[PDB]
Amino acid sequence: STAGKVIKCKAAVLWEEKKPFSIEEVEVAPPKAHEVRIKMVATGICRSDDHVVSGTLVTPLPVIAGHEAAGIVESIGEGVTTVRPGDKVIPLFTPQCGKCRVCKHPEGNFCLKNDLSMPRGTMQDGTSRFTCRGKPIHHFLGTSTFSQYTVVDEISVAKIDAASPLEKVCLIGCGFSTGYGSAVKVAKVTQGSTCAVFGLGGVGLSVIMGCKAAGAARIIGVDINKDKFAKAKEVGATECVNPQDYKKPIQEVLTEMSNGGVDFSFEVIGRLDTMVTALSCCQEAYGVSVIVGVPPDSQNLSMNPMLLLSGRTWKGAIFGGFKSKDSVPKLVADFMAKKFALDPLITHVLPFEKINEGFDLLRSGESIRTILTF
Amino acid sequence: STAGKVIKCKAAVLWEEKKPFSIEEVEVAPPKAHEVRIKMVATGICRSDDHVVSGTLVTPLPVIAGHEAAGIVESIGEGVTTVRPGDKVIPLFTPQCGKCRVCKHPEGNFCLKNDLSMPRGTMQDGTSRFTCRGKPIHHFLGTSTFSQYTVVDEISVAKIDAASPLEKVCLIGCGFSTGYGSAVKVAKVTQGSTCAVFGLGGVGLSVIMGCKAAGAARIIGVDINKDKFAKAKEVGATECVNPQDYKKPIQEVLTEMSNGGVDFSFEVIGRLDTMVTALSCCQEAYGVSVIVGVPPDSQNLSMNPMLLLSGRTWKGAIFGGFKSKDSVPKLVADFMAKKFALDPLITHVLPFEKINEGFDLLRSGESIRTILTF
Ligand SMILES: NC(=O)c1ccc[n+]([C@@H]2O[C@H](COP(=O)([O-])OP(=O)([O-])OC[C@H]3O[C@@H](n4cnc5c(N)[nH+]cnc54)[C@H](O)[C@@H]3O)[C@@H](O)[C@H]2O)c1
Numbered sequence: 190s191t192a193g194k195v196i197k198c199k200a201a202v203l204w205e206e207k208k209p210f211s212i213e214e215v216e217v218a219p220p221k222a223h224e225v226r227i228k229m230v231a232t233g234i235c236r237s238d239d240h241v242v243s244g245t246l247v248t249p250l251p252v253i254a255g256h257e258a259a260g261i262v263e264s265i266g267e268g269v270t271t272v273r274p275g276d277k278v279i280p281l282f283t284p285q286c287g288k289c290r291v292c293k294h295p296e297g298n299f300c301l302k303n304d305l306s307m308p309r310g311t312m313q314d315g316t317s318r319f320t321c322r323g324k325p326i327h328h329f330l331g332t333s334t335f336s337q338y339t340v341v342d343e344i345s346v347a348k349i350d351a352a353s354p355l356e357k358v359c360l361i362g363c364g365f366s367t368g369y370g371s372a373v374k375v376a377k378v379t380q381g382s383t384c385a386v387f388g389l390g391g392v393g394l395s396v397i398m399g400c401k402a403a404g405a406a407r408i409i410g411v412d413i414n415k416d417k418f419a420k421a422k423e424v425g426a427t428e429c430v431n432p433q434d435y436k437k438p439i440q441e442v443l444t445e446m447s448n449g450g451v452d453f454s455f456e457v458i459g460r461l462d463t464m465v466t467a468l469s470c471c472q473e474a475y476g477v478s479v480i481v482g483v484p485p486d487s488q489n490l491s492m493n494p495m496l497l498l499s500g501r502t503w504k505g506a507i508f509g510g511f512k513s514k515d516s517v518p519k520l521v522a523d524f525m526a527k528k529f530a531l532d533p534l535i536t537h538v539l540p541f542e543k544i545n546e547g548f549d550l551l552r553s554g555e556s557i558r559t560i561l562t563f
Numbered sequence: 564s565t566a567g568k569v570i571k572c573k574a575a576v577l578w579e580e581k582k583p584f585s586i587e588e589v590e591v592a593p594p595k596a597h598e599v600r601i602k603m604v605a606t607g608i609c610r611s612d613d614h615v616v617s618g619t620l621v622t623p624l625p626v627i628a629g630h631e632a633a634g635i636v637e638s639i640g641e642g643v644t645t646v647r648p649g650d651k652v653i654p655l656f657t658p659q660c661g662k663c664r665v666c667k668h669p670e671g672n673f674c675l676k677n678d679l680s681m682p683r684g685t686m687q688d689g690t691s692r693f694t695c696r697g698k699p700i701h702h703f704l705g706t707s708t709f710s711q712y713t714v715v716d717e718i719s720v721a722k723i724d725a726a727s728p729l730e731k732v733c734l735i736g737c738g739f740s741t742g743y744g745s746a747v748k749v750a751k752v753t754q755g756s757t758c759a760v761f762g763l764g765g766v767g768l769s770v771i772m773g774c775k776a777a778g779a780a781r782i783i784g785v786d787i788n789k790d791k792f793a794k795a796k797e798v799g800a801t802e803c804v805n806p807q808d809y810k811k812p813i814q815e816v817l818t819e820m821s822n823g824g825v826d827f828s829f830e831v832i833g834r835l836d837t838m839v840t841a842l843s844c845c846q847e848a849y850g851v852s853v854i855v856g857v858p859p860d861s862q863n864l865s866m867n868p869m870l871l872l873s874g875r876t877w878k879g880a881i882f883g884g885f886k887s888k889d890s891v892p893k894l895v896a897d898f899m900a901k902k903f904a905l906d907p908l909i910t911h912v913l914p915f916e917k918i919n920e921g922f923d924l925l926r927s928g929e930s931i932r933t934i935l936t937f
């Protein structure tokens with residue numbers, strides 16, 4: 190039995206930037222008041238986890254990364270009311286405290302208890318539940334899912350359907366919900382519209398899924414890797430373009446293709462140049478562009494504000510704009526009811542011990558989502 | 564007595580940047596097909612007219628500027644159906660052709676026939692109706708209201724109530740409608756919200772009027788000229804701040820004052836730095852910032868796209884988002900029914916011949932709107 194006891198288990202520790210993950214024994218403290226200890230079942234490899242490795246996304250090291258996952262509650266601390274031992278759960282990398290001005294706002298989801306703005310790499314109480322070789326190890330986004338066990342704050346976990354297939358619904362913990370919500374909730378794509386989606390990885394494909402669900406008439410996928418185009422068309426792209434194939438800048442190409450600009454554009458890569466290109470390619474008077482890609486740490490973009498003065502709307506969002514704890518159980522229920530598909534995102538399924546091979550597949554351009562299984 | 568004839572009249576010709584206007588005789592050709600010749604009655608001095616002088620807003624010189632005005636139709640060209648001789652009219656610096664994809668879009672107002680995005684300084688047919696000293700003179704935004712007579716395309720004029728006071732409703736041709744619509748239509752300010760308005764000139768005061776009409780609980784005016792604060796409070800500001808009074812940057816001040824950021828911010832100046840400051844001061848998860856000020860020609864701002872990724876919305880608009888020809892007559896009707904006030908914007912009245920004194924008043928910081936009478 191493990192309740193109230195330290196667990197020794199396997200985790201993938203990132204000791205410093207630009208190094209492989211180290212698969213080794215860590216110690217996981219039992220949950221304190223209002224905390225939940227979770228036995229991991231499956232976790233996806235999101236490009237944001239690779240950003241921690243590359244130093245694109247700064248968070249304290251050493252760290253247990255991973256934020257797109259699903260598992261089963263092993264134990265609960267004093268005062269937990271929302272999950273019980275045995276429940277299937279998805280960790281919420283964007284918390285939902287329910288009390289802050291953002292949580293109370295009808296359109297806010299970036300709860301002020303998040304650990305993304307100004308990463309501390311701890312639990313809400315400012316301490317860590319992880320040690321490895323006698324050293325404290327940081328948390329990541331209040332989740333830390335690259336471990337056989339994690340501890341999360343109650344506001345960073347949602348109970349989901351007991352019959353959920355965790356090897357699929359782990360993607361509702363980040364990439365699916367982010368892309369789909371960026372289209373249906375943040376952009377509010379309209380029926381009959383023309384969309385452009387920059388980046389055709391797991392999140393961009395999920396944007397396409399949402400644009401198609403919203404009834405877009407045209408969905409133009411944009412990627413420098415033409416190997417991504419077949420799956421983009423399978424999930425709803427009506428055409429795909431590779432900027433490398435053109436002499437003109439792709440914003441000009443997309444403006445011409447759309448007879449004067451697209452209705453909705455999405456940046457789903459993480460580059461300053463594509464953020465500005467994606468804004469520019471939406472119609473100057475009524476176009477909307479959504480930034481989804483995480484930008485490189487501390488770098489500013491350059492743009493001409495006449496792009497906005499003519500009437501464009503530019504916005505961004507975390508986790509597709511979804512209030513995380515309200516939305517994740519409903520998204521799982523919708524998946525169970527066949528309202529959307531997850532299999533198109535899953536290209537590889539590997540044991541957790543093959544985490545580095547999973548990251549190599551992402552970096553090589555050869556995977557969409559690898560699901561790691563514990 | 565002048566229909567079909569060239570009219571010799573006085574206009575304010577700008578021969579050179581950074582020089583006084585020259586009040587001198589011009590020849591105004593009669594209207595061609597689908598053109599309207601207007602005897603001007605009143606015109607306001609908008610900061611955008613000064614931007615022509617200063618080279619902030621590039622348009623071809625020499626030019627007859629002026630875009631905020633009202634007058635009486637003198638004659639119509641062949642095929643004009645929407646105005647007749649003797650009608651009161653407001654020239655529309657943003658046209659409404661009714662046929663382009665923007666005019667057909669429910670939100671769009673920046674008609675593709677505009678002369679603002681890439682100014683040519685002509686009529687729609689690429690020619691000029693103005694001669695001075697035997698030399699052709701450019702138009703400005705299709706309006707050229709600094710003249711006793713102008714000629715406009717039919718898509719750039721709206722018929723208004725015959726009992727309209729033209730010396731007041733000229734402000735509906737730019738500054739009032741721009742500011743008011745930026746609040747009520749583009750931002751969609753909500754009841755009980757907190758707003759920040761950067762720049763307390765005629766347009767910023769009109770933003771405040773709209774925020775108050777929309778039911779904002781707090782409206783924070785921001786200006787480096789504290790002489791602007793009394794009028795801002797008269798039209799609805801709850802408090803005013805001068806960034807020069809504070810050691811910290813005003814985005815930090817406004818975030819603290821609003822307990823974590825404002826609901827709606829407005830840039831109503833035309834500076835790159837205040838556009839970024841205005842974005843930053845709105846709440847990071849659900850705030851909205853609207854750019855209204857005209858930026859300096861061809862200059863790019865620098866910003867961190869994390870400001871958008873957290874959930875902010877950034878947009879801009881021309882003419883308050885109003886479809887010009889539909890909206891101007893309704894705004895005049897609403898003014899006649901006392902639904903909003905224009906007198907708070909009018910601080911000075913001068914004859915047209917004193918146009919240079921009117922620009923001196925604007926540049927010194929003394930005036931809000933000077934109305935020139937022909
Ligand atoms: N906002 C959020 O909440 C959120 C959530 C999840 C992911 N993200 C970010 O979203 C981005 C995409 O994540 P992902 O789908 O897992 O990544 P991914 O699987 O690496 O996909 C990115 C795609 O971009 C393509 N690409 C790279 N450079 C270019 C270019 N110059 N032009 C066009 N295409 C290009 C690339 O070939 C790849 O197919 C990353 O920056 C993530 O960090 C943000």
Ligand SMILES: NC(=O)c1ccc[n+]([C@@H]2O[C@H](COP(=O)([O-])OP(=O)([O-])OC[C@H]3O[C@@H](n4cnc5c(N)[nH+]cnc54)[C@H](O)[C@@H]3O)[C@@H](O)[C@H]2O)c1
Nearest residue numbers: 610611741762764765766786787788832833856857881882
């Ligand atoms: N988008 C449109 O359709 C539209 C229409 C009308 C005007 N405009 C622009 O809107 C802006 C305002 O026009 P207006 O009201 O006629 O001009 P204005 O009367 O010159 O007002 C601008 C105000 O900004 C104040 N100001 C200057 N610098 C700063 C600073 N650093 N911080 C805070 N306040 C400062 C200044 O003291 C003044 O009261 C100008 O750039 C116009 O060109 C745009």
Ligand SMILES: [Zn+2]
Nearest residue numbers: 286289292300
């Ligand atoms: Zn919260």
Ligand SMILES: [Zn+2]
Nearest residue numbers: 235237363364
């Ligand atoms: Zn992610």
Ligand SMILES: [Zn+2]
Nearest residue numbers: 660663666674
């Ligand atoms: Zn039009």
Ligand SMILES: [Zn+2]
Nearest residue numbers: 609611737738
């Ligand atoms: Zn103006």
